[PDB]
Amino acid sequence: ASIYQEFVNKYSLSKTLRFELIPQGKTLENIKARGLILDDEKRAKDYKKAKQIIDKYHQFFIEEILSSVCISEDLLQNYSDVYFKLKKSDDDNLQKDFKSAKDTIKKQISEYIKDSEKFKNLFNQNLIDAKKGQESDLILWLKQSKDNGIELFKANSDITDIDEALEIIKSFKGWTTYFKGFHENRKNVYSSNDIPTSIIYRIVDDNLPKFLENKAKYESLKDKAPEAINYEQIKKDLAEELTFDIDYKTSEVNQRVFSLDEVFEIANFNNYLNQSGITKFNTIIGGKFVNGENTKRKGINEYINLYSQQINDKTLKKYKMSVLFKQILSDTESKSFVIDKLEDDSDVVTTMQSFYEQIAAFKTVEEKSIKETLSLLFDDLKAQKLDLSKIYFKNDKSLTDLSQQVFDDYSVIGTAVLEYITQQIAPKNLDNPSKKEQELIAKKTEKAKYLSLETIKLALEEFNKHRDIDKQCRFEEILANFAAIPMIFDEIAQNKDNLAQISIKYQNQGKKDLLQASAEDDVKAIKDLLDQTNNLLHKLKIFHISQSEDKANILDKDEHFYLVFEECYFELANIVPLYNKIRNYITQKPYSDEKFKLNFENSTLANGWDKNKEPDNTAILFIKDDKYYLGVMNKKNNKIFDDKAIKENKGEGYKKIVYKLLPGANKMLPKVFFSAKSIKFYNPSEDILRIRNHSTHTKNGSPQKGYEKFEFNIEDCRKFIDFYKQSISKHPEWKDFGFRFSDTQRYNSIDEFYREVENQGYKLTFENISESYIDSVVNQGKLYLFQIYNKDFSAYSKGRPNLHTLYWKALFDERNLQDVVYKLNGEAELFYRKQSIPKKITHPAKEAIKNKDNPKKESVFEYDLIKDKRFTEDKFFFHCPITINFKSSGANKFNDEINLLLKEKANDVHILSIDRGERHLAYYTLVDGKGNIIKQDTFNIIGNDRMKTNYHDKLAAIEKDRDSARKDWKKINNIKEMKEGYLSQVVHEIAKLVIEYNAIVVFEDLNFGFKRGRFKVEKQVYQKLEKMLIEKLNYLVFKDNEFDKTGGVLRAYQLTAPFETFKKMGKQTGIIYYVPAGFTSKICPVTGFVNQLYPKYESVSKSQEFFSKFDKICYNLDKGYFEFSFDYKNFGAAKGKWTIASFGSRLIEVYPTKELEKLLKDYSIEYGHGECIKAAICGESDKKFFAKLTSVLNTILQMRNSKTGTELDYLISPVADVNGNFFDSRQAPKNMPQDADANGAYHIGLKGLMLLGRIKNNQEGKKLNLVIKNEEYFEFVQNRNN
RNA sequence: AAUUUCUACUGUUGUAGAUAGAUUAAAAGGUAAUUCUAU
DNA sequence: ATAGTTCATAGAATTACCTTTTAATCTTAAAGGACTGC
DNA sequence: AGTCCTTTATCTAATTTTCCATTAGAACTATGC
Ligand SMILES: [Mg+2]
Ligand SMILES: [Mg+2]
Ligand SMILES: [Mg+2]
Ligand SMILES: [Mg+2]
Ligand SMILES: [Mg+2]
Ligand SMILES: [Mg+2]
Ligand SMILES: [Mg+2]
Ligand SMILES: [Mg+2]
Ligand SMILES: [Mg+2]
Ligand SMILES: [Mg+2]
Ligand SMILES: [Mg+2]
């Protein structure tokens, strides 16, 4: 008897099914004659362009109105005081008094944006296509901007100029409703409600707390480290960002530069509502790069960082400013320098070729080439011809880089020069010199931009001779490093020569051929070349004089040397912008061009299936001989399936779908029964008008316009329900639904009546139509007919159909239609996927033709099969929404009902615990109530008994590819998809086990308590598996189950609620529980003993003290092993006493018993007849003795055996049971684990068993405690079997 | 190597399992490059 | 003969490209604006 | 009346985080025998 038999039809959920649309007959010829495919392809792009133009209008409106909005300082200060008070302590009245001020601010902003004249036309047809007598506000604004000569679409290439925007907007005249969905999104931008999409939310809920945090941080920064912020230098640097138009604290209108104290005043918060003000604030927080300047102008955070680092006080880290979040629709260029982009491959080719011919063409004052100049100079540095008192390294990242490159350490040069100057200067009393001696010494070693090579050579000569000859660490190594630099040009030349053909490939203006995966190899070569040059630039970057603030103390340097050098370096430094530009171009995602929406000249296409809307929506469904068909009638031929046309063409060929639906009763009934056109028909009693105007029929429903909400009255509600029933009986056609309502008195709220209305207000019927008529209208072109198709719908299909096939076929089943579970939903869409790749027969017919375990290794096919056949030709596609459990309310308090069920059916429940392992990808163990395992197998191999697939070997090869080329520019990745496919294979097996064994599922909590180690299955992938299991158990049907019994198509298992977020998974998502994985693996399954001693060898004295506090180490005479005894409370602090034994052989085979016997024989201690060694070993003094003793002690505690041979990895226990024999997974029964990862899974299951016990004793009144402590887990697992 | 689509496959013009789409917005992270610093 | 440690690392910025996750609207027939036709 | 194209009507419930916690392979060192 299945425990989950009653958990069926519990809550409703929505799903979208997808099919191919095979054109039937001459419909494709008719479509292509009318040019509808190309028209829709053009309309998709024009639709995106129109949305972009409307978005630009929205951006401008948001900017203007937010720069007009002024929030009074008193509201801001009240909000600030209460918000900061809330941090100290919580109170209900304080939270409500806070929300009061918050909502007042929000209401002021919302009333401002509602009063604005421009807002009122945003969502009407007045925006796009205006009624006669007035012109649309979008076209008005566009024409005004054009007459004002401003270019609006400089940014994007897709919109040429304002005229093209005008004609694009013009194109959609008469298609306003095509934007309805879009408009909804844009309504969300200005919502008064508490949704994160609105600018009001972004101002009040997000950026105001951030600005108050930053203000508090600035006020705190002024008391400690007041000179940390360089006020002078930011007033110099961020002048544009410190310029504001009006100061709100003083309410003065002036364009003066602002001060930080002025900027961080609360009343000035207004200047940060507009997006431009947000960029100003974020820039004064983070600084900017200027076009000409080499050093970035610093922001507040950088000053905080620099002062905190010079003081070595990480207390000030906490005063870091948080940048403000952006405005909702903003698209703004950065105040920092933005580099020019590249448009296509030809740009890359031309720029790269220009630079690389430049470097070879360049000559200096002399007639020496760039390579010639550098080679001459560096071979001249080979010899000692140059004076090292005039050549200077830059004491920067390049100096430490060259140090790490030459000596494999970054500090050797720094310590060497520091020691040289300390030895030369202030030599008397070296260790602690005088104050002036240190400050002089300070300059020579740090706070010196450059170091002469002479200083370096003397420092190294001293440091080397001081240390021994083992480490060479010679200055000649640095000289030879530089000597080697000229040789790079020849590798560059080889790559540049071989690059000719690759350049020919992309020499043409053809767009975006590099972004595709097919360019991968060619993308590598290119990058490598650049890298070389870039590396060269970084290699000789050290000599470059950074040209910054040598007020005094100029370097005495070789002028000719540095002249030719700086010329070469200035020519080479042009690669930084080139490298950045072509990296920005090449790393883009290749395409965004898969499919587009098909409309068939109907903006409202397939928006609703009802017959009354069939002319306006032009979407019909047909069935014939167990095949399903979609029909789109010509827009002009609007009435092809009128009532009069049905009877004339009645026959036996096809079956038309007649769809009737009453959607949204709460909206529809008051809409029809009080409409100005029909309020008189359903004549409302004056009492009913009162009961509607004041929402007395609804607890929280909105009242009529200008009226006020009054308290819910049950009699008013039931009277309104009686009026609804009478009006329904009055309705001209809704009585076709045949409504059977409950007694009015049984309704306790109007939503129950609304639910009955919506549940019964949807039916499907079938009108027969002769095959000849549909054939005639398809040949005539007035109707476009498509077969709704997939694999399972072919005649050759004999296997178990896809789940969506079953859902679709159930949509129109009669067993469904008697008590509707599957309900066809309204807004379906149609798409068109052009050909992506050319046809290519990868496997010719009649040849032998990957999985190793398939017996038929050379399976021959009569037919030749094409690779990726679905992308070779253009195709039509149909996305159809449906609702399942159509008459169920929805998931509410699902965990509570699951826990109630499990509490009542506890005795039958099993616990399937899963774990990811070091050797296994994932292993499962299902345990009965007492603690014994019932079944265990692995998920390394997913396979039917006919032929089985090994995913362990298939996943073994994948991880090597990423780590090898993770930083490469172009790299195709099918890895995520393949891992998800394996997990989708696994979820079905998990569901099978759950249903057959009546088990709950136990997982490792991945938000908290997750394992720190390294495993075959990554953590994120395991989280994906958990989410996939939740989603699968939302609606679980088994294809083999009958159509009406539980688990079948009509009666689906619903064991999990809908997924919300990873964090909200918590510790229970339906029948899936999540426990910390702490101490699940290194623990004994029979006694629950985990190695918590962690004994490391230290000084002999400390090891004496360690072994002092053992209880007993006496040798066991009987069974021939050693016995330790102790209490964990006496050690450095768990509880209990254990008997450690040295039986068996662990692996590092190293048998501890023999090792201990030999160690004790070689020393004085005799263990002949039960001698208690504890006192004997504390008296020993040699280091080797305690070393080997602690080593053998650690080897004893190795429950896990680490065989480097990967066939088996097993587990053995160090503590004997009451019987006296130790547990070994080598020889273990079925009821106990059979390897080590199995022990991890089994103890995950024991945590789940603690949870099952906690569920068993849960009173209905109070909350269930699902946090398992290590104390409770230890107690349970240690005394579980007593 | 056929797919509504995806992952494995031949599992024979397809076999297994999975599959909520469309639209819109934002935040977070990754990796380069660049300016500083501190060890 | 083995271990252990390191390939410098890490904090504040800016730009660019990529991805992932969460959070919103909808999954509708019929009234209403217009205009036309009888 | 019909048609096309856009705008409208507006339930219901429970929530708001809880705190639980022992690249890689290679290379140069660095010990110990
Ligand atoms: Mg303003
Ligand atoms: Mg343009
Ligand atoms: Mg739509
Ligand atoms: Mg945008
Ligand atoms: Mg310095
Ligand atoms: Mg149209
Ligand atoms: Mg229409
Ligand atoms: Mg409520
Ligand atoms: Mg199938
Ligand atoms: Mg593709
Ligand atoms: Mg494939």
Q: Is the CB of A190 under 7 A from strand D?
A: no
Q: Beta strand A783-789 with A13-23: parallel, antiparallel or unpaired?
A: antiparallel
Q: Please report, as a single letter, which amino acid is at residue A9.
A: N
Strand pairing report for A252-253 and A246-247 = antiparallel
Is strand D in 7 Å reach of the CB of A538? Answer: no
Task: Give dist(CA A923, CA A111) in Å, integer.
Answer: 60
Q: Can you tell me which residue has its alpha carbon closest to the C1' of nucleotide C24? A: A197
Determine whether A480 is exposed, middle or buried from the number of CB atoms within 10 Å of its CB (0-12, 13-18, 19+): middle
Q: How distant, in Å, are the alpha carbons of A3, A890, A907, A908 from that of A1260?
A: 20, 22, 19, 20
Place of tokens 């498509």: A786
Query: Of A391, A398, A366, which Cα lies nearest the Cα of A561?
Result: A391
Q: Report the b/e string of A349-367 with b at 16+ CB within 10 A.
A: bebbeebbeebeebebeee
What does the CA dihedral A954, A959, A961, A962 come to, rounded to 10 degrees? 140
Q: Does residue A393 contact residue A541 with C-beta atoms inside 8 Å?
A: no
**H-helix or E-strand spanning residue A22:** strand A13-23
Question: Residue A1037 CA to B33 C1' — how many Å?
Answer: 53
CB A304 within 8 A of CB A227: no
- For A1073, the token pair is 């529980």
A511 Cβ nearer than 7 Å to chain D strand: no
**C-alpha closest to that of A212 among A388, A315, A80, A45:** A80
Give residue A57 CA to ligand 7 midpoint distance, Å.
27
Residue nearest C11 (alpha carbon to C1'): A305
Residue A883 C-beta-side C-alpha neighbours within 13 Å = 17
Using the mean position of ligand 5's atoms as its centre, give its distance from the Cα of residue A289 in Å. 22
Dist CA A812 CA A1241 (whole Å)? 45
Instruction: Output Rg (C-alpha) for chain A, integer angstroms.
Output: 39
Q: Judge whether A462 and A423 are in contact, CB under 8 Å.
A: yes
Q: Which residue is nearest to nucleotide C19 (CA to C1')?
A: A589
- Residues of A 259-298 whose CB lies less than 7 Å from any atom of strand B: 289, 294-296, 298
Residue A86: what residue type?
A: L
Q: Has A205 been annotated as catalytic? A: no
Catalytic, A408? Answer no
Q: Which residue has the closest alpha carbon to B7 C1'?
A: A981
Quick one: angle between helices A475-483 and A397-407, nearest 10? 100
- Degrees (nearest 5) of the Cα angle A923, A924, A927? 145
Task: Respond yes or no: is residue A40 known to be catalytic.
Answer: no
Identify the active-site residue in A137, A345, A716, A915.
Answer: A915
DSSP conformational letter for A472: -
Three-state secondary structure readout of A581-624: HHHHHHCCCCCCCCEEEECCCCCCCCCCCEHHHHHHHCEEEEEE
| Residue A742 contacts strand B, CB under 7 A | no
Nearest Cα neighbor of A569 from A603, A597, A544, A596 is: A544
Q: What residues pack around ion ligand 2 (CB closer than 5 A)?
A: A 153
DSSP letters for A799-814: SPPPHHHHHHHHHT-H
Helices and strands (H and E) in chain A: how many: 45, 25
Q: Strand pairing of A450-452 and A627-633?
A: unpaired
CA–CA distance, A710 with A698 (Å, rounded to integer): 9
Residue closest to A724 by CA, chosen among A671, A773, A772, A676: A671
State which nucleotides on strand B lie below 7 Å from a protein beta carbon. Answer: 1-27, 31-39
Q: Write out the H or E segment, with its range, that includes residue A730.
A: helix A714-730
Spatial neighbors of A1209 by CB under 8 A, at least 6 apart, are A918, A919, A1200, A1201, A1202, A1203, A1235, A1236, A1237
Method underlying the structure: X-ray
Q: Is the CB of A978 under 7 A from strand B?
A: yes
- CA closest to C1' of C21 belongs to A1061
Burial class (CB in 10 A: 0-12, 13-18, 19+), A114: exposed
- Taking CA atoms, A897 is separated from A2, A265, A912, A1195, in Å, by 16, 53, 20, 49
Q: A829 - beta bridge partners?
A: A879
Question: Ligand 1 centre from A61 Cα, in Å?
Answer: 13
User: Which bound ligand lies closest to the C-alpha atom of A159?
Assistant: 2
Nucleotide nearest to A988 (CA to C1'): B17
Helix (H) / strand (E) element for A786: namely strand A783-789
Rounded Cα distance, A856 and A853, in Å: 9
**Is A1004 part of the annotated catalytic residue set?**
yes
Give a three-class secondary structure readout of A337-395. CCCCCCCCHHHHHHHHHHHHHHHHHCECCCCCEHHHHHHHHHHHHHCCCCCCCCCEEEC
Do the Cβ atoms of A924 and A993 come closer than 8 Å? yes
Longest dimension (CA), chain A: 119
Q: Which residues contact A103 (CB under 8 A, 6 or more apart)?
A: none
Ligand nearest to the CA of A331: 4
A984 touches strand B (CB under 7 A): yes
Nucleic strand D contact set for A 737-776 (CB, < 7 Å): 749-751, 754-755
Strand partners, A879: A18, A829
Residue A1115: which H helix or E strand, with range?
strand A1115-1116
**Which residue gives the smallest C-alpha to C1' distance to D8?**
A671
Q: Which nucleotide is the nearest neighbour of A202, by CA and C1'?
A: B26
